[PDB]
Coordinates of C-alpha atoms and ligand atoms in Angstrom, one line a residue:
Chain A
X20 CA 181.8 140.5 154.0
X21 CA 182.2 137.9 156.9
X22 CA 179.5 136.3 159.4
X23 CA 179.0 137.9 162.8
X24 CA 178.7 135.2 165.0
X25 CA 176.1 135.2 167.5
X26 CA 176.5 133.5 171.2
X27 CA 173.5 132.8 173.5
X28 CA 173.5 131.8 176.6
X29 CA 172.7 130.3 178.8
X30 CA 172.7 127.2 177.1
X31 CA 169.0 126.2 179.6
X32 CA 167.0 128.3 181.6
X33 CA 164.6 127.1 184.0
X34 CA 162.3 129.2 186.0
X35 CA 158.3 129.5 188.3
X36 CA 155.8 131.4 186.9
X37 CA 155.9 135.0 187.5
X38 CA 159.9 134.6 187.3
X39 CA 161.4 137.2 185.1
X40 CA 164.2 135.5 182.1
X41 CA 166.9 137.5 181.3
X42 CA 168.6 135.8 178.0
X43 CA 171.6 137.0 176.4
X44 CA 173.2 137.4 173.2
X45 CA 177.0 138.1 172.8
X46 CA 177.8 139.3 169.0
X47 CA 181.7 138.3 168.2
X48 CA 181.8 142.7 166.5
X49 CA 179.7 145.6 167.0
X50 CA 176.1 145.1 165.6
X51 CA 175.0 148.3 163.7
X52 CA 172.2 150.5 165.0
X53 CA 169.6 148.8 166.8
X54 CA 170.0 146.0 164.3
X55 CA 169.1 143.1 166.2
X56 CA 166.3 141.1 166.3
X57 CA 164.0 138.4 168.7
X58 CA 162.7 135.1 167.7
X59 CA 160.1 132.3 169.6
X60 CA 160.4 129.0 168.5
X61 CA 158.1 126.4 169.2
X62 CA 157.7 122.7 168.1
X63 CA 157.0 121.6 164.2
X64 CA 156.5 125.8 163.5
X65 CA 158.9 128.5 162.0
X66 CA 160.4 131.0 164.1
X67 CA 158.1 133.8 165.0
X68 CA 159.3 137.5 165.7
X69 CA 159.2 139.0 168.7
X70 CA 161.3 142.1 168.9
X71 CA 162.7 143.7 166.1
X72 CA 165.3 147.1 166.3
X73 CA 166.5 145.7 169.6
X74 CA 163.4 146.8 171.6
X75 CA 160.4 147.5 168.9
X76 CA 158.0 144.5 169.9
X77 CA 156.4 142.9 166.7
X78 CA 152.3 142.9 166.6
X79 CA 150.7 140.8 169.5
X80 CA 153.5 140.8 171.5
X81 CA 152.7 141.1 175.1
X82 CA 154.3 144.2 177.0
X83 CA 156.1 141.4 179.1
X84 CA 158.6 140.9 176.2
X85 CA 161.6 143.7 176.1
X86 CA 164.6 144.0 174.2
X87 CA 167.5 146.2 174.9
X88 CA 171.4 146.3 174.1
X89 CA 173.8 147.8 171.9
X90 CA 177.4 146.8 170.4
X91 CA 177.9 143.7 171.2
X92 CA 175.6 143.0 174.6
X93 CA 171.7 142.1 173.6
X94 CA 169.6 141.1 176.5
X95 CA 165.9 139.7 175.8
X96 CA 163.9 140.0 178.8
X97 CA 160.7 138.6 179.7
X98 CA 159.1 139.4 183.2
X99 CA 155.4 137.4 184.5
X100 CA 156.7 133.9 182.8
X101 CA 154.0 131.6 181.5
X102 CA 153.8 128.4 181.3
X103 CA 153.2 129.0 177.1
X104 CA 156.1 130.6 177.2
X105 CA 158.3 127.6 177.4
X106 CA 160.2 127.6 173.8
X107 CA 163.6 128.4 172.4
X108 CA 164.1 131.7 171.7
X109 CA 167.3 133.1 169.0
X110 CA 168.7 136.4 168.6
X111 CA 169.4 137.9 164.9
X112 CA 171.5 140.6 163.8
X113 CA 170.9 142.7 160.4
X114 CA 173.6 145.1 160.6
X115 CA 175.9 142.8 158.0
X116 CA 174.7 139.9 156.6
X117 CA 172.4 137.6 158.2
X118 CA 173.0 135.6 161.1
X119 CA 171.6 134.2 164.2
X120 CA 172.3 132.9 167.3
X121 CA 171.9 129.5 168.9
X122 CA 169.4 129.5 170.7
X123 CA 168.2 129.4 175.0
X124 CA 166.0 126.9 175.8
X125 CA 163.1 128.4 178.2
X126 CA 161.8 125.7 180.6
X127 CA 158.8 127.0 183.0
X128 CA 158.8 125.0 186.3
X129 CA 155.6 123.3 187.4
X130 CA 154.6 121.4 190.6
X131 CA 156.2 117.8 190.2
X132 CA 153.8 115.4 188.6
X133 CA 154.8 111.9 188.4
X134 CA 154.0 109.5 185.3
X135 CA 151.6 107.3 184.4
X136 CA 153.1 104.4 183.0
X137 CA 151.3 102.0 180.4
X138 CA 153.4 99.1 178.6
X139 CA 152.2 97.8 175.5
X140 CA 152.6 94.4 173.9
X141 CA 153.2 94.1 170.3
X142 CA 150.5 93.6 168.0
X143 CA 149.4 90.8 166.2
X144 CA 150.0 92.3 162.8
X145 CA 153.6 93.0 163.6
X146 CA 154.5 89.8 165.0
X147 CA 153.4 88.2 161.3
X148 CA 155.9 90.5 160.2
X149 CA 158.7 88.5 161.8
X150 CA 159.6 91.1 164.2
X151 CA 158.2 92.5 167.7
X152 CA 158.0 96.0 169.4
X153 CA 157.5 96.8 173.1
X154 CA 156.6 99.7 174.2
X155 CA 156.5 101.8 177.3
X156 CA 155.0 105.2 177.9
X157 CA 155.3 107.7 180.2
X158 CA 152.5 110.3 180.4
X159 CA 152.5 114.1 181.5
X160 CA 155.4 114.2 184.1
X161 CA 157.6 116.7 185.4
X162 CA 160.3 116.9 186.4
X163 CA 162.0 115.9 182.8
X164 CA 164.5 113.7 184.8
X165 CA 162.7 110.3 184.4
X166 CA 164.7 106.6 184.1
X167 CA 163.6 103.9 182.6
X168 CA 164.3 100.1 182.8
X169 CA 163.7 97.5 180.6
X170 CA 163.2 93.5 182.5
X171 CA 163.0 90.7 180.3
X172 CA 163.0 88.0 182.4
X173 CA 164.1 90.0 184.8
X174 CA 167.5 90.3 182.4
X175 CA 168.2 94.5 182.4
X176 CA 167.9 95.2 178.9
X177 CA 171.3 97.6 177.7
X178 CA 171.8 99.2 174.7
X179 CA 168.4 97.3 173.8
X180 CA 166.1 99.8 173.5
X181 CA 165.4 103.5 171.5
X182 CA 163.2 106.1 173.3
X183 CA 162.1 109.9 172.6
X184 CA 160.8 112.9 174.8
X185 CA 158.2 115.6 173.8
X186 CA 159.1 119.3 174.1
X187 CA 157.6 120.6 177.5
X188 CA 154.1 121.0 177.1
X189 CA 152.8 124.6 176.4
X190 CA 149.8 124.8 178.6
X191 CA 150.6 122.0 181.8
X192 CA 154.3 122.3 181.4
X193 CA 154.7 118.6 181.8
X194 CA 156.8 116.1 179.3
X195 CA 156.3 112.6 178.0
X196 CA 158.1 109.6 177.4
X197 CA 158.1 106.9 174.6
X198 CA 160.8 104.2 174.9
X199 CA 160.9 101.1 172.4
X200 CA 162.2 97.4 173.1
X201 CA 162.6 95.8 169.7
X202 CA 163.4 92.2 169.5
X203 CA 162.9 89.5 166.6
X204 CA 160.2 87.0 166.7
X205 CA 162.3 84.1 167.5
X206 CA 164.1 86.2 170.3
X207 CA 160.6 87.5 171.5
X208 CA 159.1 84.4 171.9
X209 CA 162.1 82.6 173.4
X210 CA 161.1 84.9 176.6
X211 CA 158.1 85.2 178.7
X212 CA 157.8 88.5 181.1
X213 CA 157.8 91.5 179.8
X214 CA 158.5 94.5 182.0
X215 CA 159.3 98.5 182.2
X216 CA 160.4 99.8 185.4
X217 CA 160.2 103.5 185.6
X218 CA 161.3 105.8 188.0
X219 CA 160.5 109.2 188.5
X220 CA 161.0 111.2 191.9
X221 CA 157.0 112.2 191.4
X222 CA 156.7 108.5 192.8
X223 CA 157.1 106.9 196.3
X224 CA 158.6 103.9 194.7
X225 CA 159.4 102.9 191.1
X226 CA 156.7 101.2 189.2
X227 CA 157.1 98.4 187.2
X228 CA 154.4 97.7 184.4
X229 CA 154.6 94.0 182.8
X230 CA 152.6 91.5 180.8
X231 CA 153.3 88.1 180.2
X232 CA 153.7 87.0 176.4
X233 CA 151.7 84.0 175.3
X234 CA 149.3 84.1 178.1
X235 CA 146.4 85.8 176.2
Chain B
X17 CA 146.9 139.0 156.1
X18 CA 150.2 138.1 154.1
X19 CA 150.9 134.1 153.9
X20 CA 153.6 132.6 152.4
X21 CA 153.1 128.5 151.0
X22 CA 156.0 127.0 150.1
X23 CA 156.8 123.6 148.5
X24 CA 159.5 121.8 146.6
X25 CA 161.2 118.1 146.4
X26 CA 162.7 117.2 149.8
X27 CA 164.6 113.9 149.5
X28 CA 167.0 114.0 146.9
X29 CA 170.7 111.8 146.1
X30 CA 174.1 113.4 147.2
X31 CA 175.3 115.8 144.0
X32 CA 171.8 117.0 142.9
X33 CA 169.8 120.0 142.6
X34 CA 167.7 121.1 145.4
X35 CA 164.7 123.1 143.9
X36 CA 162.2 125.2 146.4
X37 CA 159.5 127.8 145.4
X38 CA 157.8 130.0 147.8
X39 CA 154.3 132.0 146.5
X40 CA 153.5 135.3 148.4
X41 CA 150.1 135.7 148.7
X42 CA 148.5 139.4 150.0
X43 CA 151.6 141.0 149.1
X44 CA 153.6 143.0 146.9
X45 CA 157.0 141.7 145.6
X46 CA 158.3 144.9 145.1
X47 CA 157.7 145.9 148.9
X48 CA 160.0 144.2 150.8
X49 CA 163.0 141.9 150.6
X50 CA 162.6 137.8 150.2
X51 CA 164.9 135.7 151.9
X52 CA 165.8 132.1 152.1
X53 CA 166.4 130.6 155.2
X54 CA 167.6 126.7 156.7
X55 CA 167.6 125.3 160.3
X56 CA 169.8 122.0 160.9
X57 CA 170.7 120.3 164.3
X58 CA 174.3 120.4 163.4
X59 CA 174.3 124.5 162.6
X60 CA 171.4 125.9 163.8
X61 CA 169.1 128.5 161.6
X62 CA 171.3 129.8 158.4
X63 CA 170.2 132.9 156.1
X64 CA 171.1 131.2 153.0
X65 CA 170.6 134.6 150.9
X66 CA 168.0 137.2 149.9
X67 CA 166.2 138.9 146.5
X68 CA 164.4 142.0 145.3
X69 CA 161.8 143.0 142.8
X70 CA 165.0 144.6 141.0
X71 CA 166.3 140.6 141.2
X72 CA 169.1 142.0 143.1
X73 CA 170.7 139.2 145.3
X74 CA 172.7 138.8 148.7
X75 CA 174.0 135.7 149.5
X76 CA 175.4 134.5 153.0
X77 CA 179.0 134.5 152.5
X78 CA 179.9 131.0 153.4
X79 CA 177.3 129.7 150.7
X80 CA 178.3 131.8 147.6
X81 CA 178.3 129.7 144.6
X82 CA 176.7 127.0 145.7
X83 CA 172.9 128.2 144.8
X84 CA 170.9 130.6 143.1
X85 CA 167.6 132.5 144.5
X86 CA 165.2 134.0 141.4
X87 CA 162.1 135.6 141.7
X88 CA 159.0 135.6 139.5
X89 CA 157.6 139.1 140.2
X90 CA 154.4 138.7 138.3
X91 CA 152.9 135.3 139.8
X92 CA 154.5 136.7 143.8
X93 CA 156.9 133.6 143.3
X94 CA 160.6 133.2 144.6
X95 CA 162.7 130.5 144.3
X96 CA 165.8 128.9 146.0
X97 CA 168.2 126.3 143.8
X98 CA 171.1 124.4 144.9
X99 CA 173.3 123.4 142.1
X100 CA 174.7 120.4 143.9
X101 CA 173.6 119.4 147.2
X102 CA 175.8 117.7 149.9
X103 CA 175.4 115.7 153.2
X104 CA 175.1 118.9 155.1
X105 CA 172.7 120.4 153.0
X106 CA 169.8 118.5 155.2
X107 CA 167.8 121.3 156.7
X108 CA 164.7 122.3 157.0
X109 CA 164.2 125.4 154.9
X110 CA 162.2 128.4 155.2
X111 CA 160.9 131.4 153.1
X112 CA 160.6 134.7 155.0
X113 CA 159.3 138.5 154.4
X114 CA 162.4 140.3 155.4
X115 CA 163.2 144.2 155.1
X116 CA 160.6 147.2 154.6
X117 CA 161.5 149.2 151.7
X118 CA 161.9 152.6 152.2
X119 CA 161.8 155.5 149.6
X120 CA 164.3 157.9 149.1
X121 CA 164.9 160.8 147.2
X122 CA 166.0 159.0 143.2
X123 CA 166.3 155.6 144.7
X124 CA 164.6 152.5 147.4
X125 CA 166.2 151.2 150.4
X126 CA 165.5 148.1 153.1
X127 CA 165.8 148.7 156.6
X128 CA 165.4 145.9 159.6
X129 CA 166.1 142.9 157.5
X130 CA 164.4 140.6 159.8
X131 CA 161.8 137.9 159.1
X132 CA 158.0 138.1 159.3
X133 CA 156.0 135.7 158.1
X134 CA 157.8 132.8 157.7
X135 CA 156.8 129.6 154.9
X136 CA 155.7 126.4 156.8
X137 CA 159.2 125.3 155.7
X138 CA 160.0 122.4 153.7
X139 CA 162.2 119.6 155.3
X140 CA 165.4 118.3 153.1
X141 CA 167.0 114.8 153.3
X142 CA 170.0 114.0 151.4
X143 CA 170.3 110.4 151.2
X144 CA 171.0 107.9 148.5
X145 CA 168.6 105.7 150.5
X146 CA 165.1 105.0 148.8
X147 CA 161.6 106.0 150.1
X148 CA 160.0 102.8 152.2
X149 CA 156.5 103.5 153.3
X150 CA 155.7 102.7 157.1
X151 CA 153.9 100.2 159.0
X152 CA 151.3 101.3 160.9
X153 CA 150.9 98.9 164.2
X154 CA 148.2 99.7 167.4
X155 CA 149.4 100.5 170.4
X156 CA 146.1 98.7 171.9
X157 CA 144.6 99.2 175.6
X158 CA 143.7 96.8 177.6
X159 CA 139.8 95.9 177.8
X160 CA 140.6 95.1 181.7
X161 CA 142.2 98.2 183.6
X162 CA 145.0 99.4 183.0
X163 CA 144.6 102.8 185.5
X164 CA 140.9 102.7 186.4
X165 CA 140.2 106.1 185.7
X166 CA 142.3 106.9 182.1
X167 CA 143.4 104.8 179.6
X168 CA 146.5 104.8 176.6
X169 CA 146.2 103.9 173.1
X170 CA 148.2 104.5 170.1
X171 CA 149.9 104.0 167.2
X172 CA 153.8 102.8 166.1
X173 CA 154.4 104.1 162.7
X174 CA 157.4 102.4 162.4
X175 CA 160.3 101.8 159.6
X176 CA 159.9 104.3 157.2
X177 CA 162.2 106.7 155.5
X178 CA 162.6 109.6 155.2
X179 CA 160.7 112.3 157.7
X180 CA 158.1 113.4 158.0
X181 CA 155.5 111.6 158.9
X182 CA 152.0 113.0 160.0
X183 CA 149.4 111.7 162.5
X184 CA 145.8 113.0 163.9
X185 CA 143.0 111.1 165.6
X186 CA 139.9 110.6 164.4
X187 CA 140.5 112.8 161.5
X188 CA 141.2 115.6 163.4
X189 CA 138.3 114.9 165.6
X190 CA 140.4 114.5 169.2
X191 CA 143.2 116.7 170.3
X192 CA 142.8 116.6 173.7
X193 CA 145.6 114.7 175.6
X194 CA 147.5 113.3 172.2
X195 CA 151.0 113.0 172.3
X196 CA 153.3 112.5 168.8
X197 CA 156.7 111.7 169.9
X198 CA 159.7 112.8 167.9
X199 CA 161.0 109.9 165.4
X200 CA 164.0 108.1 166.4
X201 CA 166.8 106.8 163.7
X202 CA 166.7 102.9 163.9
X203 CA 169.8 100.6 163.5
X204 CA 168.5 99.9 160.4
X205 CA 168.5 103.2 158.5
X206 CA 164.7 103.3 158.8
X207 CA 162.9 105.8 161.2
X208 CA 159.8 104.5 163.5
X209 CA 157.4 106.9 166.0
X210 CA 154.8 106.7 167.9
X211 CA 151.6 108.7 168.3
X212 CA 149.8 108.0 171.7
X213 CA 146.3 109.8 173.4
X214 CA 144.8 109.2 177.0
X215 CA 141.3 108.2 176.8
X216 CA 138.7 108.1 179.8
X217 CA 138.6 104.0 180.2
X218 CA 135.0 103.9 180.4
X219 CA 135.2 104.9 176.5
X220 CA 137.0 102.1 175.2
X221 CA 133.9 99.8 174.5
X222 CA 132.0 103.0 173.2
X223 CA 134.4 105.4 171.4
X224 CA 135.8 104.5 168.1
X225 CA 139.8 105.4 167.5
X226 CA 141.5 105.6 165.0
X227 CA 144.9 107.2 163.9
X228 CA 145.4 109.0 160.5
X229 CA 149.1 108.2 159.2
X230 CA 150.8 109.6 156.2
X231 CA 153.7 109.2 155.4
X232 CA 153.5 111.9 151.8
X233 CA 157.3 110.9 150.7
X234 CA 155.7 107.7 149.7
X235 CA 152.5 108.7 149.1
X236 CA 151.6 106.0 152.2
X237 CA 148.1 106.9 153.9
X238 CA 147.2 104.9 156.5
X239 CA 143.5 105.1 159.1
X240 CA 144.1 102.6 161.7
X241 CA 141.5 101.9 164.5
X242 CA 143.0 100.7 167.5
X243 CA 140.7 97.8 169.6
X244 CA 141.3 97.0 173.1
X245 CA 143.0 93.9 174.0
X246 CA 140.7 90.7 175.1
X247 CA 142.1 87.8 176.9
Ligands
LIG316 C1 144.2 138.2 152.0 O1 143.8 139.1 153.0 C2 142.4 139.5 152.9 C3 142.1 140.5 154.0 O2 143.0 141.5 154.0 C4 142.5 142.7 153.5 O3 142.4 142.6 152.0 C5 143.7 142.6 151.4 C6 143.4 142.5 149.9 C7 144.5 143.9 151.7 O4 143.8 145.1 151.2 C8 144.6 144.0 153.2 O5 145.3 145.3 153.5 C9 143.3 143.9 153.9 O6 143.4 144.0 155.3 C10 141.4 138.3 152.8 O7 140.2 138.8 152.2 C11 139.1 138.9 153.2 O8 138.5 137.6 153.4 C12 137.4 137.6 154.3 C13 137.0 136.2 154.5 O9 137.9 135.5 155.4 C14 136.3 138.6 153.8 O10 135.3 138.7 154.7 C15 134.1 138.2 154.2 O11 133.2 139.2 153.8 C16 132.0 138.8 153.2 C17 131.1 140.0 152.8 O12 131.0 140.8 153.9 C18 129.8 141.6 153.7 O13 128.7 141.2 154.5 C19 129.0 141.4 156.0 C20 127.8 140.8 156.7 O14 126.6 141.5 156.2 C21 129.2 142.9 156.3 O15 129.5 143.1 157.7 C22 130.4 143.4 155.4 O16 130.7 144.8 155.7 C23 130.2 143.1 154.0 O17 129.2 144.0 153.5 C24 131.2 137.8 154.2 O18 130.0 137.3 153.5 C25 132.1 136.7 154.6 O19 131.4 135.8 155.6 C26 133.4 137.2 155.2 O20 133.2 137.8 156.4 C27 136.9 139.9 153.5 O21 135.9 140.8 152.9 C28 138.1 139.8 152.6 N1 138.7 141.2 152.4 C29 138.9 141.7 151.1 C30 139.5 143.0 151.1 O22 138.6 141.1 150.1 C31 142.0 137.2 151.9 O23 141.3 136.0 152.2 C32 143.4 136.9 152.1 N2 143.9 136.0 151.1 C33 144.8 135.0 151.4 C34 145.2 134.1 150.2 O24 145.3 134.8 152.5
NAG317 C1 175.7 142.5 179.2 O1 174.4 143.0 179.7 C2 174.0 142.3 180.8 C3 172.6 142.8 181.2 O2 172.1 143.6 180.1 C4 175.0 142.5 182.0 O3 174.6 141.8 183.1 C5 176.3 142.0 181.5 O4 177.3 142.4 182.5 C6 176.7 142.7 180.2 N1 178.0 142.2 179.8 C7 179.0 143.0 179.2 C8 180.2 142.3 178.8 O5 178.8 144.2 179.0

């Protein structure tokens, strides 16, 4: 027995509401019967079936979902996209052993909404520790295209920082931002301005949120 | 309705044995197949292998040898065990439900061996590295404005090791606009994250918040409020 390997794509799909996805999955040999299978993955949860036997939706499965294929072409479609809908979904064949595909991301396009930026100084408790974190946070914008800049002194800060994106929101499709400036006490305190310069094409301009440090 | 709890040792030391148990609950063992199954960044979701009530096995090919999957069909238990883990053994792994059975005529089949419900998996790190229980720092508002209308506060939960990490607000209390980010892998070996929620900024001299951390690796519980900033 060998592994059938199992090929998505595409890769990214990005559609409105009310857009119908058409996903594919490629199997490397012929898959079996109707031996195929549907998943919808979303963030911190297992894998949850959709469509098993190609096209026999699993229960609470909206009629939007439909599978269909044979051989070696599987197609997943779903028509009237939502905004929960956003996920990654993966194909699985059962005609040999076990194996699934890798997986299209679904993005559901919104109307743009820019971010609102908040900077925060580090705390107290950390700077006893000997070390200081800055961070900067973009809230609820889309879309996920988003740059951010880090001014100390107005020095641009390169390679200096560490930053992570939420998964698209399920129910107002938007993303976040968290970036991190990390710096030592003795280097924190050698500077005095502070600042994160986001831009976002939600904005007329790029906004710059700052504090001075010591001025409390 | 069928639930499947799962649990098991997650961090472990290159060249030991991975042990995971799975209990079925509103279900008969002798009604479907049980499977074992891992997701990794680097290869994606892997049917590691599959039992019966008969204790009849399938393994995934590629895996043979390396682990054994027993089931306890009296307590609705199943387990997976790797002999000897490796590097890229790091997963997060999952029990499933996987085929019906299906009598025939002097013997029982399984037909569409796919997988429904799934365990609330069980995350794996294979490190050498030991368990360091996190710091839990505010990420505190300002008591002026900072946006008139809505206001951000948080927490950094930061150099720790290994995931996961958990965080709610106000022990469970507020939902509503709270963001966890996704951990980032410092220069330093350690992970750090941050939890953030937008609050009306009329609240902040009213509304008390605080963030519960726990970090369960190291048995590290943390409830931090977070106080606006004064100048
Ligand atoms: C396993 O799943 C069952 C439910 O699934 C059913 O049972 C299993 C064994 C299989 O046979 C399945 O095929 C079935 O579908 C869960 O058990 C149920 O739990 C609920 C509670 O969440 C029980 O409901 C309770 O009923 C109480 C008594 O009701 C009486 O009074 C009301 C009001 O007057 C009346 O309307 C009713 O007709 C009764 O006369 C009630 O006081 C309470 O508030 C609650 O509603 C339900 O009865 C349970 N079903 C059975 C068959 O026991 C298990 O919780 C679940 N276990 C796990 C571990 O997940
Ligand atoms: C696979 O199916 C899709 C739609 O179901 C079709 O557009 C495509 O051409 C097919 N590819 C092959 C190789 O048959």
């Amino acid at each position: 027995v060998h592994e059938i390997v199992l090929t998505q794509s595409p890769g990214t799909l990005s559609l409105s509401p009310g857009e119908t996805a058409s996903l594919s999955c490629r199997a490397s040999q012929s898959v079996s019967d109707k031996n195929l299978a549907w998943y919808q993955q979303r963030p911190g949860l297992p894998p949850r079936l959709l469509i098993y036997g190609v096209s026999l939706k699993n229960t609470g499965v909206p009629d939007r979902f439909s599978g269909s294929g044979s051989g070696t072409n599987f197609t997943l479609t779903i028509t009237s996209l939502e905004s929960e809908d956003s996920a990654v979904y993966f194909c699985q064949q059962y005609g040999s052993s076990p194996t699934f595909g890798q997986g299209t991301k679904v993005e559901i396009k919104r109307t743009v909404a820019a971010p609102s930026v908040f900077i925060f100084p580090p705390s107290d408790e950390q700077l006893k520790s000997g070390t200081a974190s800055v961070v900067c946070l973009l809230n609820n914008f889309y879309p996920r295209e988003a740059k951010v800049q880090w001014k100390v002194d107005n020095a641009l800060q390169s390679g200096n920082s560490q930053e992570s994106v939420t998964e698209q929101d399920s129910k107002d499709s938007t993303y976040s931002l968290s970036s991190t400036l990390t710096l030592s006490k003795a280097d924190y305190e050698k500077h005095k301005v502070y600042a994160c310069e986001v831009t976002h094409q939600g904005l007329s301009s790029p906004v710059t949120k700052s504090f001075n440090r010591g001025e409390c | 309705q069928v639930q499947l709890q799962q649990w098991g040792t997650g961090l472990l030391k290159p060249s030991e044995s991975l042990f995971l148990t799975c209990a079925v609950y509103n279900e008969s063992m002798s009604a479907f197949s049980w499977s074992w199954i891992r997701q990794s960044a680097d290869k994606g979701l892997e049917w590691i292998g599959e039992i019966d009530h008969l204790q009849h096995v399938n393994y995934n090919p590629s895996l043979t040898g390396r682990f054994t999957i027993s089931i306890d069909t009296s307590k609705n238990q199943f387990s997976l065990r790797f002999f000897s883990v490796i590097a890229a053994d790091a997963a997060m792994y999952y029990c499933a439900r996987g085929g019906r059975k299906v009598y025939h005529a002097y013997w029982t089949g399984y037909v569409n061996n796919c997988f429904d419900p799934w365990g609330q998996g069980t995350l794996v790190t294979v490190s050498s590295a030991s368990t360091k229980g996190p710091s839990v720092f505010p990420l505190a508002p300002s008591s002026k404005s900072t946006s008139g209308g809505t206001a951000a506060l948080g927490c950094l939960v930061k150099d720790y090791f290994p995931e996961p990490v958990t965080v709610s607000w106000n022990s469970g209390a507020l939902t509503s606009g709270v963001h966890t980010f996704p951990a980032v892998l410092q220069s330093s070996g350690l992970y750090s994250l941050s939890s953030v929620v937008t609050v009306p900024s009329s609240s902040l001299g009213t509304q008390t918040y605080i963030c519960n951390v726990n970090h369960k690796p190291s048995n590290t519980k943390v409830d931090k409020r977070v106080e606006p900033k004064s100048c």
